[PDB]
């Protein structure tokens, strides 16, 4: 009586149940694991807070309306302030982590709409100015708020044009990245497990984000007659196999 459909994920002191899942994706078919010695470089023993950092943090909720263009969060940024995960983050020189991402959106059998939930490794954004204008730090570190693709261009911020993925590629091809759809008629959640993907064994958690999670409405939300025209979307994310190394004074970052 197991269905692909019902699932339970327990991680730390927190549990999620979905009764309307559509399997789960594990990026590149690899599950998060700690850093092996053969791959290690820094000689420091690392710190593995385990259950105090590897639990589920639910970010603040978004509201899908007929005019929504899509939202974008960066990792580990989105979690920069969650509990002890965040403290560890500002206090060590280097850290490394994988995540379980669970995006939630329920409706009824009269609604229609379909969101794309995708994880993009190394999502370098484009400046809407063109040329070689850079995208300032603050703009690519929105924190739990994430970036709202239907917000206005700002100065020093990225471009927010959806048919171009914020980088000069077409929305249609985002499907080459680990992703899952939430089609109100099928699905009510999306779950993706992200292994740590980098060109170095461990890195800085503040100067470099290693994935952007993106939720994009593709088939517009259509509510039943005289229904309220909107649904909330909630994102809950859990660091998994986290390791921190090179402890010290506590980083100070712009803004």
């Amino acid at each position: 009586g197991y269905s692909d459909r019902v699932q339970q994920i327990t991680l730390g002191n927190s549990t999620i149940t979905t009764q309307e899942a559509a399997n789960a994706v594990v990026c590149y078919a690899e599950w998060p694991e700690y850093l092996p010695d053969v791959d290690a470089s820094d000689v420091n023993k690392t710190s593995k807070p385990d259950t105090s950092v590897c639990r589920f943090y639910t970010l603040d909720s978004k509201t899908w309306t007929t005019g929504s263009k899509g939202w974008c969060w960066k990792l580990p940024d989105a979690l920069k302030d969650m509990g002890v995960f965040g403290q560890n983050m500002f206090f060590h020189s280097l850290g490394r982590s994988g995540y379980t991402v669970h995006v939630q959106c329920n409706a009824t059998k009269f609604h229609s709409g379909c969101l794309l939930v995708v994880v993009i490794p190394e999502h370098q954004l484009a400046s809407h100015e063109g040329g070689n204008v850079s995208v300032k730090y603050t703009f690519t570190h929105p924190g739990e708020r994430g970036i709202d693709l239907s917000s206005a261009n700002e100065v020093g911020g990225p471009v927010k044009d959806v048919l171009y993925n914020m980088n000069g590629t077409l929305l249609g091809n985002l499907l080459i990245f680990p992703h899952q759809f939430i089609n109100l008629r099928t699905n009510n959640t999306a779950t993706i497990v992200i292994p740590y993907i980098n060109s170095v064994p461990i890195d800085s958690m503040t100067r470099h984000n290693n994935v952007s999670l993106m939720v994009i409405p593709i088939a517009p939300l259509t509510v039943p007659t005289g229904a309220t025209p909107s649904l909330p979307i909630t994102v809950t994310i859990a660091p998994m196999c986290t390791e921190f190394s090179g402890i010290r004074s506590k980083s100070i970052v712009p803004q």
């Binding site: 490794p121 190394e122 484009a126 040329g131 070689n132 471009v159 171009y164 503040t206 100067r207 980083s251």
Partner: protein
């Protein structure tokens, strides 16, 4: 080894109905939905190997230097008496779009350098010039005049070849990390105004060119073309191909008021 023979079906087992919401592309074949006959592949997919795809020489840079009397020149660099180039693979777009199909890439480089001379204004003859190409890694003294102590290049690899000829040598993968980042969503530090995206993670050295010859009575323009061939390629994490035009080395930025990249139908959705 392409299609097996398959006949009529009347089952409870439907391989063509799936749920794309899952993120999978189910491996459906012609024989799941029509009646097929056996056929063999006769093919291996040899020429689509990434080593093959990135393994041919591409022009990565065209520069130019001239041989002329430096007498009274206050700025050799500025007179193109000599010229440097910080190696890149993202300035001419053909090879760039190919590499950016991947996120991290690792390979050895084979460089070919073709040098041809031009004599746009009245010369009695064509002189025979020798070019010197010096590989200047970050931290080395940089040439200031076209005949500085720098050119001694006692510790820095340099090649001398003749204009009209070609020079060829190969450099191991010089990246600092395990792969070169084709993309980097980071900064060099948490500064409020530091540059975004451009990184040393991609840095491949830099190269300075000059003519060794002193000047003849006429002036001679020498134009340098650098070709780059990846050998021993390793590529990770495929990405969506580049759709809009490029504007800058190292940023993803596209031009404003660009044009629609998807061709509009001449007719209906229903049109053929």
């Amino acid at each position: 080894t392409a299609s097996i023979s398959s006949g009529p079906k009347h089952t409870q087992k439907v391989p063509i109905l799936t749920a794309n919401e899952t993120g999978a592309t189910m491996p459906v074949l012609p024989s799941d939905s029509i009646e097929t006959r056996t056929t063999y592949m006769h093919f291996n997919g040899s020429e689509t190997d990434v080593e093959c795809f990135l393994g041919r020489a591409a022009c990565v840079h065209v520069t130019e230097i001239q041989n002329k009397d430096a007498t009274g020149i206050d700025n050799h660099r500025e007179a193109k008496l000599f010229n440097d180039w910080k190696i890149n693979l993202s300035s001419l777009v053909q090879l760039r779009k190919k590499l950016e199909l991947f996120t991290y890439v690792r390979f050895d480089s084979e460089y070919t350098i073709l040098a041809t001379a031009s004599q746009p204004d009245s010369a009695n003859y064509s002189s025979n010039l020798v070019v010197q190409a010096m590989y200047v890694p970050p931290g080395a003294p940089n040439p200031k005049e076209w005949d500085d102590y720098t050119w001694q290049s006692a510790s820095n690899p340099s090649v001398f070849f003749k204009v009209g000829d070609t020079s060829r040598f190969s450099v191991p993968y010089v990246g600092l990390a395990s792969a070169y980042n084709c993309f980097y969503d980071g900064y060099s530090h948490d500064d409020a105004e530091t540059q975004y995206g451009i990184t040393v993670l991609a840095h491949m050295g830099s190269m300075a060119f000059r003519i060794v010859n002193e000047h003849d009575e006429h002036k001679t323009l020498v134009k340098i073309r650098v070709y780059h061939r990846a050998k021993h390629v390793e590529a990770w994490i495929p990405r969506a191909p580049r759709a809009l035009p490029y504007t800058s080395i190292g940023r993803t930025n596209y031009p404003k008021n660009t044009e629609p990249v998807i061709k509009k139908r001449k007719g209906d959705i229903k049109s053929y």
